[PDB]
Amino acid sequence: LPESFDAREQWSNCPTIAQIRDQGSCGSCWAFGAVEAMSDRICIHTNGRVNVEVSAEDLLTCCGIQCGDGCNGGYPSGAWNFWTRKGLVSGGVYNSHIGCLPYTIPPCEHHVNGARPPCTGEGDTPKCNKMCEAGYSTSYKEDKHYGYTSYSVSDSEKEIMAEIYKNGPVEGAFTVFSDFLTYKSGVYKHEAGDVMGGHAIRILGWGIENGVPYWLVANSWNADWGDNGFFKILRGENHCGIESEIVAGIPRT
Amino acid sequence: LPESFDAREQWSNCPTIAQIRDQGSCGSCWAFGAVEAMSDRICIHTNGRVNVEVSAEDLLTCCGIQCGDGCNGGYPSGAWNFWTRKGLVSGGVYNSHIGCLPYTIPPCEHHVNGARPPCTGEGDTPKCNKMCEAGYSTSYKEDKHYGYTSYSVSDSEKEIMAEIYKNGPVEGAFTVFSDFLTYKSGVYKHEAGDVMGGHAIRILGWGIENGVPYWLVANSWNADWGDNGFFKILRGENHCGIESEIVAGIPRT
């Protein structure tokens, strides 16, 4: 296995892999981490032939109790589970107007002095409407994209690495401390600050930066957070349980 | 698979299965759900031959950063990794003087009234003393028992059940609300309640209360909290994440 890896280089024809989104003022990081990596994988699974942004709207509103409690938080493995069964329509970003269900919660500043509104506390969850936005060609039903299988990956570096290399990006989670919130670049290790909680993310590569091994990680706090919305985190010593909740799946053909 | 199951009667030769520990004033439930399930497994796998209380003290204090922040909380999957690599010594309950390193943190009252002092959040992590207590027949390095494997179990009801039924109780986790804290009897469904955090526990069976399918769970809050130390929580609904984070392993024997 190579000394570093990027899903975006390895599968450059797939655009969603370089994309960064915004969950807004809603705790849908469980939903985002999932729908991001599904998009990457549908594309990867099809040599590019299929290129869908899978909807964060669909999963967040329509999943139910299995995924947890919506904008108040949720469970990744419920996400991929719902995907293998009820499956997931496409949906661009806020006012993208692409696919079936574009995401309907606005972008905001996540701990950064920008020009968009302040995010403020987890939004409330919207209802589930089994119908694509008006203008979209096919219906919700016909627009579903299915998972064939989903699974948890074990706490083993080499294993989480083999998975990203062979099947594309995965979903992870980790404890979040205050000192995280103002990350800018380099490799995040924890030193200071209080607990804030788990928070789900999409892992898309690994590498070494000045002696230090890392996971390359996409956050859903838009691109003016961190390193263009991405970040690196210590790899190897379960740092913040980053290696404890890897979940993944294979798209149906 | 059976419609009902109890590891406690499946392997009645295996006493640790029926035992409720007390974690005391320390957030070491991640440690307690693992050594508990590990003991159960060492007993089941050697068919009776080896019977030990695996030490909570050793895990909690000597595992380090791969497991978390000790008494402030940690990560089940880093516990089972530790076992497979560095091993765990024998330790019974507080003032048992059984085994190498018995637990050094006092039993207390956990969201109940009782004869014992109230628990506290304030819980320092005892240091990693790599010495068996005085009297113990065998030295610390000698008394270590090792994991052969550690693995995450996928979010599948039918798959979780079959792991237990074929291999022993498991460790797992769920999101705790405040309505949980005052449970007594019956099957847990989260109705009301506010969010309090994760809780790592040990699952040892399943069944059906009045139509309601549930999982049999050992808490580590002593026996006067709840149903003699155990509780039932609903099944098949990833309810409060119960089917989301299951970890296990096979003893080296």
Curated annotation (Swiss-Prot), chains A, B:
The modification N6-acetyllysine is found at K141. The active site is at C29, H199, N219. Glycans are attached at N113. Disulfide bonds join C14-C43, C26-C71, C62-C128, C63-C67, C100-C132, C108-C119. It comes from the Eukaryota. This is Cathepsin B. It comes from Rattus norvegicus. The chain holds residues 80 to 332 of 339 of the full protein.
